[PDB]
Subunit: 252 residues, 4 copies
Amino acid sequence: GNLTGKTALVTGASRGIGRAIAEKLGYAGALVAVHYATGADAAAEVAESIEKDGGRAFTVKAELGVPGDVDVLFEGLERGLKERTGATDLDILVNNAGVMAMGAPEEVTPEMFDRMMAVNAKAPFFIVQRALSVMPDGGRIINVSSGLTRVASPDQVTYGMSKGALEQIALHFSRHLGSRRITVNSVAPGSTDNGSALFQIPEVRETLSQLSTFGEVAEPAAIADVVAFLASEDARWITGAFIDASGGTLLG
Amino acid sequence: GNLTGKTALVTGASRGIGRAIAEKLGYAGALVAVHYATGADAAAEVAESIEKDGGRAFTVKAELGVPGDVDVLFEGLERGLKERTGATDLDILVNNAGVMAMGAPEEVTPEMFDRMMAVNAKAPFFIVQRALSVMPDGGRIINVSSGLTRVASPDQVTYGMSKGALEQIALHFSRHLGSRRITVNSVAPGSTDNGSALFQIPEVRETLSQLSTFGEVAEPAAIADVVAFLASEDARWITGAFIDASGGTLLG
Amino acid sequence: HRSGNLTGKTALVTGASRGIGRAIAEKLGYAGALVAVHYATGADAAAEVAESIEKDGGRAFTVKAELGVPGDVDVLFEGLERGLKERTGATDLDILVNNAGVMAMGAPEEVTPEMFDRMMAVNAKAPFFIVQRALSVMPDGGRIINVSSGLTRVASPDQVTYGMSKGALEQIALHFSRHLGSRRITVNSVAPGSTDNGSTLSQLSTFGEVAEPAAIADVVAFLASEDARWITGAFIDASGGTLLG
Amino acid sequence: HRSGNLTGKTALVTGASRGIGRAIAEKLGYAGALVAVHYATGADAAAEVAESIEKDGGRAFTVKAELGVPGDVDVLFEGLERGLKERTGATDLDILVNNAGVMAMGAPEEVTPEMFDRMMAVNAKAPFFIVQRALSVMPDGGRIINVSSGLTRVASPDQVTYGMSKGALEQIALHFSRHLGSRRITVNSVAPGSTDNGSTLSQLSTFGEVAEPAAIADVVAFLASEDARWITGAFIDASGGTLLG
Ligand SMILES: NC(=O)c1ccc[n+]([C@@H]2O[C@H](COP(=O)([O-])OP(=O)(O)OC[C@H]3O[C@@H](n4cnc5c(N)ncnc54)[C@H](OP(=O)(O)O)[C@@H]3O)[C@@H](O)[C@H]2O)c1
Ligand SMILES: NC(=O)c1ccc[n+]([C@@H]2O[C@H](COP(=O)([O-])OP(=O)(O)OC[C@H]3O[C@@H](n4cnc5c(N)ncnc54)[C@H](OP(=O)(O)O)[C@@H]3O)[C@@H](O)[C@H]2O)c1
Ligand SMILES: NC(=O)c1ccc[n+]([C@@H]2O[C@H](COP(=O)([O-])OP(=O)(O)OC[C@H]3O[C@@H](n4cnc5c(N)ncnc54)[C@H](OP(=O)(O)O)[C@@H]3O)[C@@H](O)[C@H]2O)c1
Ligand SMILES: NC(=O)c1ccc[n+]([C@@H]2O[C@H](COP(=O)([O-])OP(=O)(O)OC[C@H]3O[C@@H](n4cnc5c(N)ncnc54)[C@H](OP(=O)(O)O)[C@@H]3O)[C@@H](O)[C@H]2O)c1
Ligand SMILES: C[C@]1(O)CC(=O)c2c(cc(O)c3c2C(=O)c2cccc(O)c2C3=O)C1
Ligand SMILES: C[C@]1(O)CC(=O)c2c(cc(O)c3c2C(=O)c2cccc(O)c2C3=O)C1
Ligand SMILES: C[C@]1(O)CC(=O)c2c(cc(O)c3c2C(=O)c2cccc(O)c2C3=O)C1
Ligand SMILES: C[C@]1(O)CC(=O)c2c(cc(O)c3c2C(=O)c2cccc(O)c2C3=O)C1
C-alpha cells in the first residue's frame, strides 16, 4: 500500500497495458480513474477487479482526438475525485491511451495522420496541461511511448512520429515542473500481448518474440510493474527520462 | 560543382537557414527550387543570387499546413523541373520550412498546436511521401530539426514535440529507402541568426550566444555547409542519422 | 528475520562501506537479500553497515578486497564464496551491484598515465572481471547492475578520465544483456547525478538539490527485483533531471 | 603541388598504412593537407600511402610508433614534430585523426586481463594522451576526430572489450569539445559500421553492403574542413544505417 492516499488517472484503461497499469496502481492503494472511449463494460470490469482486491476505482468516458475531449475527461475525473475524496487533487497521470496502425508509408492519408497525432500526442499534451492545475507537489506524470522510436519500422512510421512527439513531453515538462517536484517520464514497452487476436497467430507471435532478447513478447503486467515503480516515492530521483522496458529489444 | 546535374527542393528558402541552404546548393551546381509561402520578393532575390553566381533556380509558392498544400507544391515543382531539365526527377529534398512559437506551456491552445504540428511534421511527412515517386536512386532527404529535442525548454514544448516527430522520419524512412540508396537524415542547428529583429536585442543575443560552446549564435551559412555535405556523394554512408550542428550546444 | 521481496536471494554490493553503496546494501538487505558488504579498507564502516542490516532483521557480512590490483577478483570471490557457503551452503549469487569506484578532478593537461590506469583499473576493468567471474555462480533470473554516472552525458573537462571509465562501464550493460538474454539475467546501468556521499553542484539537478544516497538505492533495489524483469541493456537515468541540456 | 581546401594545414592520421586510416590519409592529402602517415610496423604500406599522396601532387611522410607501450606518445611526437619542422619550419598540428586501433573477437568468458589491457591501451589510452600532447602544438581552428565504432550502439557479446574501449574513446569528444570551445578546436567521434579493410556482416547495413574505406574517409575529410565548423562534441554515425535497431 505504498500509494495509499494517492489518486491516479490511467487513460486507455479498459484493456491491454492500461488495464494492467490500473490493476497494479489500484493494488498499491491508489484511487484509480479507469478511462475509456467506447469500452464501457470492459472499463467497469477493470474497476470492479480493483475493488474486488480491496482498492478503489471508477470509470471515466472520454473519446480523445476530437474537440472538447479533455474538457469531457476532466469534468468526469474531477467530479469523481471530489465525490470520493473531497478534493480534485490528481497525484498520478498515466497517458496510456493510444492508437496503432500498420500500412505502407505510400498509402498513409492525411486523415490517418491527424488521427494518429491527435490521439497519441495532442491529447496527451493537453491532458498534461489540464493536469497541472490539479496536481500536487510530488506528483507523477508517466507517458507510455514505444520502442519503435529507436527501431526503424517503415510500416509504422506515422505511429513512430507520434510517439517521438510524445517523448518530448517528458524532456520539456520535467524542466518546467522541477520545483514542484513532479517527475515526468517516458516508458517504452516493446511488443506486448494486449489480448488481441493478432498475438494468437503463431507465425506472427514467433516473429515478435524474436525481437526481445528474452525470446518472448511481454505480458502487460511486466510494463505495469515499471509504471507502478515510476509512480512511487522510490522513483523520486528519476525525471525527464526514457525508460527502456522492451525486454532488450533496443540492443541494435 | 559536385552537385552538377542534380535537382533540389529547399522549403522555406525565402529567408534564414533555407536561403543559405539554397545558396550553397545552387553554388554547388544543383538546380534549386526555392520554396516559399508569402515571401515572393524574397524568394525571387534568392533565385536571382543563385543565377547571378552562375547556377540555376526558380521559385515555388506553397502555403504548408492547409489541405492540398503538397499538391500545390509538387504541381509547381514538377512543372518547373520538367520545363528546365526535361524530367520531374528530384535528387535532393530539404525539409526546412518551419514555424517557431514561444509561450508558457499553460497558454498553448489546440489551434497553436495544430499549426505547429501541421507545418513542422505533417507537411514534411507528406512531402517525403510525394517525393518518393520522383526521386531517383542515390537521392537525398534532409530534415532540418532543432537541438531543442535534446535541451529542455518549457516555452518551446510544442515546437519541441513537432521536431521530435520530424526526427522520426529519418529513422523509419532510411530503412524503407536503403535499397534505393536514398539517405534520410536530421540536421539539428542550435540558435541561429535568421536575420530577424530578435537577434538584434543585445541582451537576448548575449543569452543565446552563451548556449554554444563557441560563445556565439550560428550564422546560417554554418548550417548550410553541413546540409551541402549531406547532399553530396561524400555523405553516402550516412543514413537515419541525427547530425548535431549546434556548435556544441548539446554538451549537457 | 524480516521478510520481503528479495527473501531467498544473495547479493554482492561492491563498495558498500559508505555512500551510495551503503544505501544500496541497507536497501537490498531490508528487502530480504543476504548482502555481502564489500570494502577496500573501510572495515569499520562496512561492519557498521553489515550490523545495521542484521539489526533490522536482515542478513549480511563483509568482504575485503582492494580492486584494480592483480588478484583483486580472486580475493573478492574467495571471501564471498566462503561467506555464502557458511550461510546458505551454496555459492549462488543472484544479484551483482558494481558500485565501487574512484573519482578525481584536475586539469586534463595534468592527467598522468598512472592516474589513467588507476581510473580504468577500478571503474571499468574490475567491473568487467567481476561480471565475468559472477557468471559461473549466477542462477537464471539473476541481476547485474552497474553504477555509472550522468557525467557520461554532461561534458566536464576536469573529469575526462572518470567519464572515459564510466563510458567503458556502460558498455557492459549493452553487450552482456544480449549475451545473457536466454538465461534471464538482466544487465543495466544506473546513472546517478550529484550525490551527497558525505565529504554549486546542487544547481545541476532540475530539483536544485544534490541527491541523498537513498534516492539512488531506491532505483537499484527496483532493478534488482522481479518488477524490473523486462528492463535489460538499459541506461537508467537517476540524476534527478540533470541530463536535461 | 595540387591545391584544395586544406592547403596550409598539417595533419596526423594514426594507423594510415592500411584500411580506413589509409583512405583518410589519401583523402586529407588530396585536399591539400601535409599528412603524417603513422604506422606501427607496416612501413612498406605506409611509404606506399605517403608515395601515393605525393604522386597526386600532395605532401606527406611516414612516422613510426607502436602505441599502447610506455613511451609511445613521445616516440610518435618525436617523429611528427621532426617531419613538420623539416617541411614547414614549425611544429603546428592543425588536424588530429585518432584512427589506429585493435580488434578482437572471442567468447566473453575467455577474455584475459592481458587482452583487456591491450584493447584499452591502444583504443582509449593512447588516443587520450595523443590528444593531451597535441594541445600544446594545435592552433585555434584545429580539428580532432576520433574513429570510434557503431558497436558502441549495437550489442555484440564477442566484442565486449572492444566496445568498452570505443565507449571510453567516445567520451574524448564530449569532454574536450567543452574544454576547447573558446580555442575553436572541434572534437568529434565518427562511428563506422562494418568496413572492408581487406582481410553476413554486409547484412547489418541498411544498404546490404560492407563499407569501402573511402566512404568513411569522405566523412572524416568533411569534419576536418571549415564546412564542419559548427559540429563539435558530436557522435557522427557513418555506419550506412546499421544503427537502425
Ligand atoms: N501493445 C504493444 O505492443 C505496445 C507496444 C509498445 C507501446 N504500446 C503503447 O501502449 C499503449 C496501450 O496499447 P495496448 O496495445 O495495450 O492497448 P490496445 O487494446 O489498443 O488498447 C488501447 C486503449 O486505448 C484506448 N483508446 C484508444 N483510442 C482512444 C481514444 N481515441 N480516446 C480515448 N481512449 C482511446 C482504448 O479504449 P477503448 O477500449 O474505449 O476503445 C483502449 O483502452 C498505447 O499507447 C500503445 O501505443 C503498445
Ligand atoms: N533559427 C533558429 O534558431 C533555428 C534553430 C534550429 C532550427 N531551426 C529550424 O530551421 C528552419 C528555418 O528557420 P529559420 O529561423 O531559418 O527561418 P525563419 O525566418 O522562420 O524562416 C522560415 C521559412 O519557412 C517558411 N515557412 C514558414 N511557414 C510556412 C508555411 N506554413 N508554408 C510554407 N513555408 C513556410 C517561410 O517562408 P515565407 O518567407 O514565405 O513566410 C520562411 O522562408 C526551421 O525548421 C526551424 O525550426 C531554426
Ligand atoms: N558521488 C556522486 O556524486 C556520484 C555520482 C554519480 C555516480 N557515482 C558513482 O557512485 C559510486 C559510489 O559513489 P560514492 O560517491 O558513494 O563513492 P564513495 O563515497 O567515495 O565510496 C566509494 C566506495 O568504493 C570503495 N572503493 C574505492 N576504491 C576502491 C577500490 N580501489 N577497490 C575496492 N573498493 C574501492 C570504497 O571502499 P572504502 O571505504 O574501503 O574506501 C567505498 O566503499 C561510484 O562508482 C561513483 O563513481 C557517484
Ligand atoms: N574495420 C571495421 O569494420 C571497422 C568498423 C568500425 C570502426 N573501425 C575502426 O576503424 C579504425 C581503423 O580500422 P581498420 O579496420 O582500417 O584497421 P586495420 O585494417 O587493422 O588497420 C589498423 C591500423 O592501426 C595500426 N595499428 C594497429 N595497432 C597499432 C598499435 N598498437 N600502435 C600503432 N598503430 C597500430 C596499424 O598499423 P600497422 O600497419 O603497422 O599494423 C594499421 O595502420 C580502427 O580504430 C577500428 O577500430 C573499423
Ligand atoms: C500491438 C501491435 O499491433 C503489434 C506491433 O507490431 C507493435 C505495435 C505497437 C508497438 O508499440 C510496437 C509493436 C511492435 O511490434 C514492436 C516490436 C519491436 C519493438 C517495439 O518497440 C514494438 C512496438 O513498440 C502494435
Ligand atoms: C530563432 C528563435 O526565435 C530563437 C530561439 O529561441 C530558438 C528558435 C528555434 C530553435 O530551433 C532554437 C532556438 C534556440 O534558442 C535554441 C537555443 C539553444 C539550442 C537550440 O537548439 C535552440 C533552437 O533550436 C526560435
Ligand atoms: C562526488 C564528486 O566528487 C562530485 C562530482 O563532481 C561528481 C562526482 C561523481 C559523479 O558521478 C558526478 C559528479 C558530478 O559533479 C556530476 C555533476 C552533474 C552530473 C553528473 O552526472 C555528475 C556526476 O555523475 C564526484
Ligand atoms: C573488421 C572486424 O573484424 C569485423 C567486425 O566484426 C567489426 C570490426 C570492427 C568494427 O568497428 C565493427 C565490426 C562489426 O562487425 C560491426 C557490425 C555492426 C555494426 C558495427 O558498428 C560494427 C563495427 O563497428 C572488426
